[PDB]
Amino acid sequence: HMEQQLYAVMDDICKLVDAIPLHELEMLSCAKELLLQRGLRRKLLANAVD
Amino acid sequence: HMEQQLYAVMDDICKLVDAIPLHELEMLSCAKELLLQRGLRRKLLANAVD
Structure with missing residues (x-):
């Protein structure tokens, strides 16, 4: 229940x-890594689809 | 499993x-909601401590 709320x-x-x-x-100090990680999530979400 | 990878x-x-x-x-268009949600995540992580 709580795990679901956090997710x-x-x-x-x-x-x-x-x-x-x-x-x-690009104005963010973490721009490069944020771009990388949001790309990785996008790919993993699609890969988890049957 | 790649659910763990996604998490x-x-x-x-x-x-x-x-x-x-x-x-x-505060440069981000989504600043107000980003502030709210990152605060909420902290609260949920703490609430899950047992």
Whole structure:
């Protein structure tokens, strides 16, 4: 129950990150790694589909 | 299993978000919700401590 609530908030943070435009993302000190990780999540979500 | 891999990447994205300095975060169009959600994640992680 609680695990599910946490997963949902984590996914919500990831949804926000997905929608950050590149010109905004590039202003962040963590830009390179954030771009890498949001790309990795996108691929893993698709790979987990049957 | 690659659910574990997905959880790890989601957590990594959340860790990056957790460390964005406030002056950078406020440059993002999604700043208000990103602040709310990263606070909520901290609360849920703490609530799960047993």
